[PDB]
Design a protein around this motif. Structure first.
Motif, PDB file in Angstrom:
ATOM      1  N   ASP A 136      24.179  18.058 -10.495  1.00 19.06           N
ATOM      2  CA  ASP A 136      22.813  17.501 -10.369  1.00 19.06           C
ATOM      3  C   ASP A 136      22.687  16.409 -11.421  1.00 19.06           C
ATOM      4  OD1 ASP A 136      20.032  17.103 -10.767  1.00 19.06           O
ATOM      5  OD2 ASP A 136      19.560  19.224 -10.508  1.00 19.06           O
ATOM      6  N   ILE A 137      22.449  15.161 -11.010  1.00 16.52           N
ATOM      7  CA  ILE A 137      22.327  14.124 -12.076  1.00 16.52           C
ATOM      8  C   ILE A 137      21.180  14.507 -13.018  1.00 16.52           C
ATOM      9  CG2 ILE A 137      20.917  12.227 -11.069  1.00 16.52           C
ATOM     10  CD1 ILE A 137      22.865  10.264 -12.207  1.00 16.52           C
TER      11      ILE A 137
ATOM     12  N   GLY B  38      14.762  10.305  -3.306  1.00 16.74           N
ATOM     13  CA  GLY B  38      16.181  10.221  -3.633  1.00 16.74           C
ATOM     14  C   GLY B  38      16.391  10.506  -5.104  1.00 16.74           C
ATOM     15  N   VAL B  39      17.428   9.900  -5.664  1.00 18.74           N
ATOM     16  CA  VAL B  39      17.730  10.017  -7.092  1.00 18.74           C
ATOM     17  C   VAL B  39      16.521   9.523  -7.911  1.00 18.74           C
ATOM     18  CG1 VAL B  39      19.175   9.054  -8.905  1.00 18.74           C
ATOM     19  CG2 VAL B  39      20.242   9.896  -6.831  1.00 18.74           C
TER      20      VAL B  39
ATOM     21  N   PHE C 180      25.644  15.446  -6.345  1.00 18.67           N
ATOM     22  CA  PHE C 180      24.994  16.771  -6.136  1.00 18.67           C
ATOM     23  C   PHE C 180      25.286  17.345  -4.736  1.00 18.67           C
ATOM     24  CE2 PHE C 180      22.396  20.255  -6.762  1.00 18.67           C
ATOM     25  CZ  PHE C 180      21.089  20.176  -6.332  1.00 18.67           C
ATOM     26  N   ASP C 181      25.272  16.498  -3.714  1.00 16.48           N
ATOM     27  CA  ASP C 181      25.571  16.971  -2.336  1.00 16.48           C
ATOM     28  C   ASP C 181      27.003  17.526  -2.298  1.00 16.48           C
ATOM     29  OD1 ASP C 181      24.433  16.418   0.773  1.00 16.48           O
ATOM     30  OD2 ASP C 181      26.570  16.701   0.516  1.00 16.48           O
TER      31      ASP C 181
HETATM   32  O1  LIG Z   1      20.400  12.062  -2.953  1.00 17.57           O
HETATM   33  S1  LIG Z   1      19.960  12.993  -3.947  1.00 17.57           S
HETATM   34  O2  LIG Z   1      18.647  12.773  -4.336  1.00 17.57           O
HETATM   35  N1  LIG Z   1      21.018  12.743  -5.245  1.00 17.57           N
HETATM   36  C1  LIG Z   1      20.756  13.515  -6.373  1.00 17.57           C
HETATM   37  N2  LIG Z   1      21.590  13.847  -7.329  1.00 17.57           N
HETATM   38  N3  LIG Z   1      21.050  14.596  -8.305  1.00 17.57           N
HETATM   39  C2  LIG Z   1      19.772  14.902  -8.188  1.00 17.57           C
HETATM   40  S2  LIG Z   1      19.213  14.150  -6.728  1.00 17.57           S
HETATM   41  C3  LIG Z   1      20.154  14.692  -3.352  1.00 17.57           C
HETATM   42  C4  LIG Z   1      19.210  15.647  -3.606  1.00 17.57           C
HETATM   43  C5  LIG Z   1      19.404  16.932  -3.115  1.00 17.57           C
HETATM   44  C6  LIG Z   1      20.557  17.250  -2.429  1.00 17.57           C
HETATM   45  C7  LIG Z   1      21.510  16.282  -2.201  1.00 17.57           C
HETATM   46  C8  LIG Z   1      21.286  15.001  -2.656  1.00 17.57           C
END
Ligand SMILES: O=S(=O)(Nc1nncs1)c1ccccc1
Length: 167
Positions: free
Chosen positions: A20-21, A46-47, A154-155
Motif C-alpha cells: 500500500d503506498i 486513485g492514489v 497495491f493491486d
Molecule cells: O490504484 S490504487 O489507488 N493504488 C494504490 N496504491 N496504494 C494505495 S492506493 C488501488 C487501490 C486499491 C486497490 C488497488 C489499487
C-alpha cells in the motif's frame, strides 16, 4: 543502505513491492513520495485520493493554494510540495490520462521528473484509474528513471503479472 523492506529488485535502480503506498509511506517516511496527480491537483480518487485522505485533506488545501498562485501543471510535468505526515516531500507527477485522450508518449516525460530525486517511493505511473497499459508503464519507468525508485503496487494480481511478465 535505506529503510525500504520486502522489495523485489528488477534492475540496478528499480524495485517493486505488493504494498500500500499510503501504508508504505506511513512506515518508511521516505524523503519523496510520488503522487499520481492531475494538472489541477484535484486529489479525488486513485492514489491521489488515498494519499490526500491519509493527510486529512491537508494535501488538497496546500494544492489549492499552489494552483491559485501558479495555475495548472502540464501533462508530463510535476511540482514538489509537502509530504505532510507521509514523507518529507510529495512529488506530484502528471502522467497522461488515457480516459481523457492524452498522448501516451508523455509518460516518458512524466517519469523524467523522477530523475531530479535520488530516491523515491512511487505508484506505477498512469496505472489504475489513469488506464494506461500498466506493463507498459513499468517498461517506461525502467527505461527512463536512473535514480532509485521503489514502486509500491497495491493491486496483488497486477503485481504478480508485472513480475512474471518483466523482461
Ligand atoms: O490504484 S490504487 O489507488 N493504488 C494504490 N496504491 N496504494 C494505495 S492506493 C488501488 C487501490 C486499491 C486497490 C488497488 C489499487
Amino acid at each position: 543502505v535505506n529503510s525500504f523492506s520486502g522489495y523485489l529488485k528488477l534492475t540496478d535502480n528499480v524495485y517493486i513491492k505488493n504494498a500500500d503506498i499510503v501504508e508504505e509511506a506511513k512506515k518508511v517516511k521516505p524523503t519523496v513520495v510520488v503522487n499520481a496527480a492531475n494538472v489541477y491537483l484535484k486529489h479525488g480518487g486513485g492514489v491521489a485520493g488515498a494519499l490526500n485522505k491519509a493527510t486529512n485533506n491537508a494535501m488538497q488545501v496546500e494544492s489549492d493554494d499552489y494552483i491559485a498562485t501558479n495555475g495548472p501543471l502540464k501533462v508530463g510535468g510535476s511540482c514538489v510540495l509537502s509530504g505532510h505526515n507521509l514523507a518529507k516531500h510529495c512529488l506530484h507527477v502528471v502522467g497522461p490520462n488515457v480516459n481523457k485522450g492524452e498522448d501516451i508518449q508523455l509518460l516518458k516525460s512524466a517519469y523524467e521528473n523522477f530523475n531530479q530525486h535520488e530516491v523515491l517511493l512511487a505508484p506505477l505511473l498512469s496505472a489504475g484509474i489513469f488506464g494506461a497499459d500498466p506493463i507498459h508503464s513499468l517498461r517506461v519507468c525502467v527505461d527512463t528513471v536512473r535514480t532509485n525508485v521503489y514502486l509500491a503496487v497495491f493491486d496483488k494480481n497486477l503485481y504478480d503479472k508485472l513480475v512474471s511478465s518483466f523482461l
